[PDB]
Enzyme design. Structure first.
Site, short mmCIF file in Angstrom:
data_model
loop_
_atom_site.label_atom_id
_atom_site.label_comp_id
_atom_site.label_asym_id
_atom_site.label_seq_id
_atom_site.Cartn_x
_atom_site.Cartn_y
_atom_site.Cartn_z
CB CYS A 1 -3.67 9.94 -13.19
SG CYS A 1 -2.06 10.25 -13.95
CE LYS B 1 -3.64 1.10 2.76
NZ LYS B 1 -4.25 1.93 3.81
CB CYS C 1 0.75 11.90 -9.95
SG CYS C 1 0.03 10.72 -11.10
S1 FES Z 1 0.43 12.88 -14.19
FE1 FES Z 1 -0.93 14.53 -13.56
S2 FES Z 1 -2.37 13.57 -12.12
FE2 FES Z 1 -1.05 11.91 -12.81
#
Ligand code: FES
Ligand code: FES
Lengths: 77, 76
Positions: free
Chosen positions: B46, B27, B44
């Site tokens: 995403c 995790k 990030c």
């Molecule tokens: S590269 Fe920008 S939120 Fe993942």
């Protein structure tokens, strides 16, 4: 003697299934000076308190075998 | 005779969000002290960034390819 195999985890699913879909790109921005002791931000897009983590990641990880977790911004000791 | 095509599927949820990052860590959590950040950091959300945990703009490709609407977290 050498044996090779691979496991393919690639997919083209959306990461965010349900959150604020009327927003074409969901970005948040906070000032440090107005944070508390700790802010725990969601990186799994399942929290019911998005952008804050509510522990929803654990259900996702358990289901899919993933290992995602939140980002923490805290006050130093 | 409706003009509609119906698709009924049935399968378990197998789609991981993180495809490749630190997979020996069960995790992945990052924690930073606010005092030691610069003027700005962009994180990030995403799991596609080549600079994870930092946003490198990889989310644009992901959103275009999947129809998603994810973006980063800015602390300033
Ligand atoms: S590269 Fe920008 S939120 Fe993942
Ligand atoms: S609820 Fe999403 S990272 Fe915890």
């Amino acid at each position: 003697g050498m044996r090779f195999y691979v496991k393919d985890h690639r997919n083209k699913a959306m990461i965010n299934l349900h959150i604020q879909k009327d927003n074409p790109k969901i970005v948040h921005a906070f000032d440090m000076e107005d944070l508390g002791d700790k802010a725990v931000y969601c990186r799994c897009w399942r929290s019911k308190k998005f952008p804050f983590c509510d522990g929803a990641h654990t259900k996702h990880n358990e289901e899919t075998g993933d290992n995602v977790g939140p980002l923490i911004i805290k006050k130093k000791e």
